[PDB]
């Protein structure tokens, strides 16, 4: 099913992921909101995953992170949304979602988080239920099996 | 083979003590070969043990003597992959961790603090994997005792008795219990002996006397 441009693959409901999707159209706010799966890749020589809910389609990507998730970036690397949002922008963290031609993928595309809102970053893509979004200082750190396309 | 698209349930970080000692991940998923459900334990993407479906005979959440941040999931089975093991699956979930993990999966909100919410969820995914996990300490009871020289926990459930968890782990279906005969050693402590319909005797010694009442009542 296709919400707000985004092409969304829907798993059978029994599936854990299906129950971890809360992406919906939100009446009062008058827009679409988005669960994303954050996967933080720290600096190797162990992952931290977190799923945020009700992120506003009209928000830059850093804007809809989440305290805990920031905190956790702040420990893998180096406090109101205002600042948090501001400290990740001058940060050097690259952000990769994954890319598709039902089937999982290990092909990633880096995305230009500061030059677009989530809704635009997602418009003509595919997600499995809802975006997964990898975070790392370098590619080396992304999980093994995962390969980025430039 | 297994990923987010055929994974029924996935909990990282369980402390498997039988049929092996190791920190593992617990996973229910439907095989992409034939749509069939499977229980596996993973090390990253190793599979130390997989059970396919029938196969699981009995499974249950059990408390950990004297340790409430902790909980056993106990599962018995007719067979597994390569017959690598035979002994029952005992593992130990941490409560607090379980909650925070359910939270980091977005399965439960920041505020929720009742573990039985996790438990509800595990029991349900399990039914989706062709099997029941009972939860009889939410009328059951357990006590300490010894077999020969080894201490263990004797748990008394509605339809089973389990003696755990040093190898060999015993399970007795209640309907297989011909008799339990009692025997004093002190005013403070006694021995109980189970007798199976096929004549095997199992001498559960050194039970505290305060437990006597609960055992008679059970029969």
Residue numbers in the entry:
A (entry chain B): 128 to 172, 178 to 210, 225 to 247, 253 to 301
B (entry chain A): 66 to 118, 121 to 205, 218 to 298
Paper text:
To understand the mode of interaction of Bcd1p120-303 with Rtt106p65-301, we characterized the 3D structure of the complex using X-ray crystallography. The asymmetric unit contains one Bcd1p120-303:Rtt106p65-301 heterodimer. The three loops in bound Bcd1p encompassing residues 173–177, 211–224, and 248–252, respectively, were not built due to the lack of density explained by their high flexibility in their native free state. The crystal structure of the Bcd1p120–303:Rtt106p65-301 complex revealed that Rtt106p interacts with Bcd1p only via its PH1 domain. Most of the residues from Rtt106p that are buried upon interaction with Bcd1p are located in two distinct parts, including residues of the first S1 and S2 β-strands, solvent-exposed residues from the contiguous α-helices H1 and H2, and residues from the loop connecting these two α-helices.
Biogenesis of eukaryotic box C/D small nucleolar ribonucleoproteins initiates co-transcriptionally and requires the action of the assembly machinery including the Hsp90/R2TP complex, the Rsa1p:Hit1p heterodimer and the Bcd1 protein. We show that Bcd1p binds Rtt106p and controls its transcription-dependent recruitment by reducing its association with RNA polymerase II, modulating H3K56ac levels at gene body. We reveal the 3D structures of the free and Rtt106p-bound forms of Bcd1p using nuclear magnetic resonance and X-ray crystallography. Bcd1p interacts with a region that is distinct from the interaction interface between the histone chaperone and histone H3.
